[PDB]
Amino acid sequence: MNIFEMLRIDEGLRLKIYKDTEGYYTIGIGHLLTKSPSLNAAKSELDKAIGRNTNGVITKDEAECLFNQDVDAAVRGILRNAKLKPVYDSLDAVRRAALINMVFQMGETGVAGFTNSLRMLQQKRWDEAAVNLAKSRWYNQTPNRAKRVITTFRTGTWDAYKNL
Ligand SMILES: *CC(=O)N1[C@H]2C[C@H]3C[C@@H]1C[C@@H](C2)N3O
Ligand SMILES: [Cl-]
Ligand SMILES: [Cl-]
Ligand SMILES: [Cl-]
């Protein structure tokens, strides 16, 4: 297991524009295109992202390209964020992946707002952090995925992604 395999499980792979859990146009391995309700706006974003006139379908190679870019961007967003960088630096490898996963799903600003959870993670108070992380819109809207990420923070193992 690694961050790529973890996010591939959590995000799936679809080669045509689809709506994500929040109803937003997405493609590939969880590549958000836009929050606009306009499908044409989403197709314009896709064409710009891929560099060709795509009319909404991409190849697996193109999906994996966006995924590489998106994982790299999540890591770089963590490291440039004054709230997230110290937490990331304090964590072991498995828990670093859990934090990247959250940023991939919700964005840097959203995760950076989990102030009390982030402090508990820095303090290595893993059971307390796990309880606090579940008191969130995130956990209520995507409970199975949030449970997997939270188990990863609680235990520091990949156990929640084994059997998947
Ligand atoms: C991201 C990626 O893997 N790429 C992009 C740049 C080059 C090489 C590959 C496939 C495609 C998109 N190509 O233009
Ligand atoms: Cl629509
Ligand atoms: Cl709550
Ligand atoms: Cl879920």
Ligand SMILES: [K+]
């Ligand atoms: K998805």
Ligand SMILES: [K+]
């Ligand atoms: K604890």
